[PDB]
Symmetry: C3
Subunit: 68 residues, 3 copies
């Protein structure tokens, strides 16, 4: 199954990009900390965290269905 191995490849790419996205978000948080504090960013944090949970969920789902 070149298709299956390829699907794992795409999943790994998404996983890697998620890590990149997380580091990018962290970069922004550090900037916010300088420039203004982070109190006004609670809802933004929530949106990002929620999307992260959604993505992690989909990765697990892919691994779950991959697995048997």
């Amino acid at each position: 199954s070149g298709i299956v191995q390829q699907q794992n490849n795409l999943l790994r790419a998404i996983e890697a990009q998620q890590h990149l996205l997380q580091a990018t978000v962290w970069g922004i948080k550090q900037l916010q900390a300088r420039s203004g504090g982070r109190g006004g960013w609670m809802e933004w944090d929530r949106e990002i965290n929620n999307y992260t949970s959604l993505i992690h969920s989909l990765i697990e789902e892919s691994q779950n269905q991959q697995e048997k």
Copy 2:
């Protein structure tokens, strides 16, 4: 078709990550607004918007070919 359902899973992950990317971009825009204004960021906005159109396009394409 575990392969097809799995492909939808990957598409959903990309869709979710796009939402995350969009929120992340918004975070940067707010920072730019403080720190310097946004006049010098028109071309950057254009590049991001263009890539967003490209991505939205690919999502629709995937859904289009999914569909029948």
Copy 3:
């Protein structure tokens, strides 16, 4: 193979999102340059660059296995 063409579609989406991610990272770097310099961001740069290499690698891998 609607599945194969669809897999290319997903790969293209990831490729496009990578370009978006790269532009987003650049946006943050410019902000850091104003607000504080970039000396303290060497390790962050390294993490992002490393994840970018990992992603580029997976794209090539997908294209490699696509190809024959």
